[PDB]
């Protein structure tokens, strides 16, 4: 297995530097994932900007917002596209957190992403060849 916590941390750190923010916290996998999420981001750019504006992120709504969106995303199953959208969505929440002067939310979202990966996505990811199979498919 690849360490999903490390995959979350590297991706979130990457996304925040894309916005000019600097967040203190296998390389082929990290690069392939960031490329797929970037592609997805650019493909649906206007949609994600509109989502951002409706997020209404506060410390009291963030946890439930993350959980409800992610449970809907995977409601009837998992595939690699939904895994990419999951990283995109978590990244959008982290960006909104720093943009709204709630940068401590970033650390919480990263943990919620890591926890969802390990609690709900690990079996599917492993059953389907692990992150190496993602690299082979998106490469």
């Amino acid at each position: 297995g690849y360490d999903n916590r490390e995959i979350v941390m590297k991706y979130i750190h990457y996304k925040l530097s894309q916005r000019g923010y600097e967040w203190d916290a296998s390389e082929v996998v990290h690069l392939t994932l960031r490329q797929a999420v970037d592609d997805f981001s650019r493909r649906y750019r206007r949609d994600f900007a509109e989502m951002s504006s409706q997020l209404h992120l506060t410390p009291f709504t963030a946890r439930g917002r993350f959980a409800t969106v992610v449970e809907e995303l995977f409601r009837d199953g998992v595939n690699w596209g939904r895994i990419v959208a999951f990283f995109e969505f978590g990244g959008v929440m982290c960006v909104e957190s720093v943009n709204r002067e709630m940068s401590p939310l970033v650390d919480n979202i990263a943990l919620w992403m890591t926890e969802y990966l390990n609690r709900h996505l690990h079996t599917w990811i492993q059953d389907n060849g692990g992150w190496d199979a993602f690299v082979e498919l998106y490469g």
Binding site: D47, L55, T68, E71, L73, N79, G81, R82, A85, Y138
Partner: peptide
């Protein structure tokens, strides 16, 4: 409510995106 709409749209886009691999 807002979250259920976000999730459905995300799901729509994911399944489109996965097909483009």
């Amino acid at each position: 409510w807002l979250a259920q709409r976000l999730g459905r749209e995300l799901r729509r886009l994911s399944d489109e995106f996965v097909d483009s691999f």
